[PDB]
Amino acid sequence: GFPIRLVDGENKKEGRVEVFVNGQWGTICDDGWTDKHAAVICRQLGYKGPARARTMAYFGEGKGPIHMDNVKCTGNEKALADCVKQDIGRHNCRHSEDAGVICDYLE
Known part of the structure; x- marks a missing residue:
């Protein structure tokens, strides 16, 4: 699998997804x-x-x-790691499009 961490959230259950x-x-x-x-x-x-x-x-x-x-x-x-990669694009992504999450979302 991949190491993963969440960064720059207000608490450890949310933030920008980083992968190693x-x-x-x-x-x-x-x-x-x-x-x-x-x-x-x-x-x-x-x-x-x-x-x-x-x-x-x-x-x-x-x-x-x-x-x-x-x-x-x-x-x-x-x-x-168990998700599947896709060749759907010419890969013009920028850090302005970085993904994130909130885990155990309440309300």
């Missing part, structure tokens, strides 16, 4: 990023409750590589 790939921490593009993706990230982090996506660098932009461009998740996966 090819020796570096980097971000995930929000193209196609929905609540199903958020469920999977939050599940991998050990949270069990409802999750919600946050798009367009909601918590702030990341820096360094954008590791993944178009992740396809059913929403049921236990880990980001």
